[PDB]
């Protein structure tokens, strides 16, 4: 019967929650209170990247930690030389309402997608000189919200449809599709071993997926509204969430609990972009009150406020080297921030 | 300073010249967003305008009196309008289309309009209503078989407002219902609206050719009122 089926479901959920809370003697706060809190970190804008006509929704550093790519509502991708603020390429898009972008690890490709349910792959190292589209991925049914290359021939997408898919650019098929969510999947992040990834799906629930097998290996439920951002710790055994309830939370793929709740009564609007630092000690989060509040991963406080934008920040990424950090906002400006000593 | 300073200058400033060339085009075209239900003319209206000037957005562009408009019909999307309506702020106006023939599928149409109007990211976006399928309403309520008061009992003690504009050769016993369904939406709009954005109802039926002109005039009014509120005179 349906009622009995829902019964066992409920008791399985209870067996999930009690087992999860069984192994929860301590919190990061207890183990980090004795640890020395980090000082008040103070970044400063070291150069500004003017040129976008309208709002900015995405950015992503290259693997050289010097090139950059960013997406805008006017429908352009711009590749900056972040050292000299030079412009390398200006790629006009077919659809203006792009919502994400990604830069291939080899540096040969960039990807972008948006409200049109298409993921576009661009070729940067063309023998003919210009930048051309190399592939279109049209299997999705909802709007596309994030893209992440695995290599030159494998990309993973997350759409407004309650689905994540694994593509292969050579053929354009949908080798593996990931289902189980119930809301719009918003963010995405690859583990630093190219074997698992996570996705927040507008239902306060995040999941861990297996790029090879295909089934949802693990699911977390600790928020209370739409989950807007997600990112792996540099370890590969953790990930932080940012949601519309103005709270960030840190999970762990082998603990099945949220660890720290990143709350502040002064902060009232929801998170929009989350990224970590190379050491994993500085959790940087974009917000909607026009600042990029910088939190400490372990000590659960605010050790820095990167407020230099006029409109709402929307994207936030760090270099693979770790020497800088960039922020894009709805003011059409992209600022690379760095410290000074 | 090196001979490879062409990348430093003679490439980046050519790109910048192209970008500032495109900026003039961008900040000269008004973007419009079209919303509606499945049983309405939101497909017919857009194609009719297009005729004479698993995909996602169905782009549509047209101009009236040397002013360019980019209307974005949103296509194959899920039922929720929650998290992709944020991208459509700072457009000139939202074009909401309602079916008037149905009455069963009207209460949730008002609910959807209320949801759009009270959205947090659209508090500065004026809405343009097209109470479409009105020829069907005219030919239907004349052969009276479904009573409006069954779904809306307040229609009973309703009086046609003095500022009515009935078309020539029109039964006055359709106009009360017309303005009833209109001012239901209007009273939903006025409540909790502090002048930053207004509601602009219109009466199109199926094939009114003067829809581009209506959108043009409404956009002019929207811009004029926005400035007159900035230029504190209104």
């Amino acid at each position: 019967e349906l009622d009995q089926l829902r019964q066992e479901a409920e008791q399985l959920k209870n067996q999930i929650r009690d087992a999860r809370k069984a192994c929860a003697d301590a919190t990061l706060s207890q183990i980090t209170n004795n640890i020395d809190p980090v000082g008040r970190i103070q970044m400063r804008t070291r150069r500004t990247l003017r040129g976008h006509l309208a709002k900015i929704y995405a950015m992503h550093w290259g693997t050289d930690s010097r090139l950059l790519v960013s997406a805008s509502q006017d429908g352009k991708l711009i590749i900056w030389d972040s050292y000299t603020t030079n412009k390398v390429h200006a790629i006009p898009l077919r659809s203006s309402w792009v919502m994400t972008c990604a830069y291939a690890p080899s540096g040969n490709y960039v990807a972008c997608g948006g409200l049109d349910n298409i993921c576009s792959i661009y070729n940067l190292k063309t023998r003919e000189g210009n930048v051309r589209v190399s592939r279109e991925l049209a299997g999705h049914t909802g709007y596309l919200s994030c893209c992440r290359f695995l290599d030159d021939n494998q990309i993973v997408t997350s759409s407004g449809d309650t689905t994540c898919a694994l593509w292969d650019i050579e053929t354009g098929q949908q080798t593996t599709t990931f289902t189980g969510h119930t809301g719009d999947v918003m963010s995405l992040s690859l583990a630093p071993d190219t074997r698992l990834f996570v996705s927040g799906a507008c239902d306060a629930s995040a999941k861990l997926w297996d790029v090879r097998e295909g089934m949802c290996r693990q699911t977390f439920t600790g928020h209370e509204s739409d989950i807007n951002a997600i990112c792996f710790f540099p370890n590969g055994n953790a990930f932080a969430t940012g949601s519309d309830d103005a709270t960030c939370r840190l999970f762990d793929l082998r603990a099945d609990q949220e660890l720290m709740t990143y709350s502040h009564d002064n902060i009232i609007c929801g998170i929009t972009s989350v990224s970590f630092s190379k050491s994993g000690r500085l959790l940087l989060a974009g917000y909607d009150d026009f600042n990029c509040n910088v939190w400490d991963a372990l000590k659960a406080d605010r050790a820095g406020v990167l407020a230099g934008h006029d409109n709402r920040v929307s994207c936030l990424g760090v270099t693979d080297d770790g020497m800088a950090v960039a922020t894009g906002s709805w003011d059409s400006f992209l600022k690379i921030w760095n410290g000074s000593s | 300073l090196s001979a490879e300073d062409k990348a430093a200058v003679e490439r980046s400033k050519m790109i910048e010249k192209q970008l500032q060339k495109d900026k003039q085009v961008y900040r000269a075209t008004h973007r419009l967003l079209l919303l509606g239900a499945d049983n309405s003319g939101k497909s017919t209206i857009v194609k009719q305008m297009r005729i004479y000037h698993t995909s996602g957005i169905f782009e549509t562009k047209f101009q009236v009196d040397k002013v360019n408009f980019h209307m974005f019909d949103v296509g194959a999307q899920r039922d929720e309008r929650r998290k992709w309506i944020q991208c459509f702020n700072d457009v000139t106006a939202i074009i909401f289309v309602v079916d008037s023939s149905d009455y069963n599928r009207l209460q949730e149409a008002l609910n959807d309009f209320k949801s759009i109007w009270n959205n947090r990211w659209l508090r500065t976006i004026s809405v343009i209503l097209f109470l479409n399928k009105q020829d069907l309403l005219a030919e239907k309520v004349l052969a009276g078989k479904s009573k409006i008061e069954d779904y809306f009992p307040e229609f009973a003690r309703y009086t046609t407002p003095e500022d009515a504009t009935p078309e020539p050769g029109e039964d006055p016993r359709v106009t009360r219902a017309k303005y009833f369904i209109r001012d239901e939406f209007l009273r939903i709009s006025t409540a909790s609206g502090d002048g930053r954005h207004y509601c602009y109802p219109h009466f199109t039926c199926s094939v009114d050719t003067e829809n581009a002109r209506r959108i043009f005039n409404d956009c002019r009014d929207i811009i004029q009122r926005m400035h007159l509120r900035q230029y504190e005179l209104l």
């Epitope: 023998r127 000189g129 | 090196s2 001979a3 490879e4 490439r11």
Partner: single-chain antibody
Framework: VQLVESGGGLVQPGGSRKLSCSAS????????MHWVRQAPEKGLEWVAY????????YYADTVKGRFTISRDDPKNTLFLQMTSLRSEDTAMYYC??????????????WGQGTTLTVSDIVMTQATSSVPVTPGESVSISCRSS???????????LYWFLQRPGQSPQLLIY???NLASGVPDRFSGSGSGTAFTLTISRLEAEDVGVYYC?????????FGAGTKLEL
């Protein structure tokens, strides 16, 4: 990607000619354009340069007055106007594309070049000829005058191989970066004033003459050349 030249031929001294480069198969308007000449048995010598958008134009100090360069993007053709040909202008003029951005490979593609007959940094290539057989390794030397290593980190030394009956072809740009269609046998190195090119295993398609270019300033000079024989 294909450049073909025209406008060459015998010239009575005191006349003038209008050399042209006709590009095809690439975004010509995004590429800078050079001209390089070569005496019938000497090394190469830079001629002129015009940038993308015609904003920047240089010339060789030898003939900076008589010559004049010009491009025309819509027809994807490049022009060289030259007047009052001196006695020494007998050479094999080449047309070279070069796009400059972070990570690009300037001088990557060389045209087939045209012929003509009329009736301060320098590099010295120590060796003139090296006998060789297939199989072993070869290191070709080339020294300079100033230090090519710039502050930003680049070095601006180039390595083009020209086969006995073919056009020059880039091997290693900026002293360490290998080109697109070149096998990974080749490798470059050097001090910063004296440089060397290294080849692991020779084949039948590695003989010819090797040339080393500097690009630190505008007069991109050449070495005399090293020619390998079997």
């Amino acid at each position: 990607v294909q450049l073909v030249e025209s406008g060459g031929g015998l010239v009575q001294p005191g006349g003038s000619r209008k050399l042209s480069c006709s590009a095809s198969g690439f975004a010509f308007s995004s590429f800078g354009m050079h001209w390089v000449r070569q005496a019938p048995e000497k090394g190469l010598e830079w001629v002129a340069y015009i940038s993308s958008g015609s904003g920047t134009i240089y010339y060789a100090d030898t003939v900076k007055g008589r010559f004049t360069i010009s491009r025309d993007d819509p027809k994807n053709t490049l022009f060289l106007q030259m007047t009052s040909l001196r006695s020494e202008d007998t050479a094999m003029y080449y047309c070279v594309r070069s796009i400059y951005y972070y990570g690009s490979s300037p001088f990557d593609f060389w045209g087939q070049g045209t012929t003509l007959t009329v009736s301060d940094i320098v590099m010295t290539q120590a060796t003139s000829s090296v006998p060789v057989t297939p199989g072993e390794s070869v290191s070709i030397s080339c020294r300079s005058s100033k230090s090519l290593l710039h502050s930003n980190g680049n070095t601006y030394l180039y390595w083009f191989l020209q086969r006995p009956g073919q056009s020059p072809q880039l091997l290693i740009y900026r002293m360490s970066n290998l080109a697109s269609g070149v096998p990974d046998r080749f490798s470059g190195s050097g001090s910063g004033t004296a440089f060397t090119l290294t080849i692991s295993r020779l084949e039948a398609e590695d003989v010819g003459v090797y040339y080393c270019m500097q690009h630190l300033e505008y007069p991109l000079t050449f070495g005399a050349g090293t020619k390998l024989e079997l």
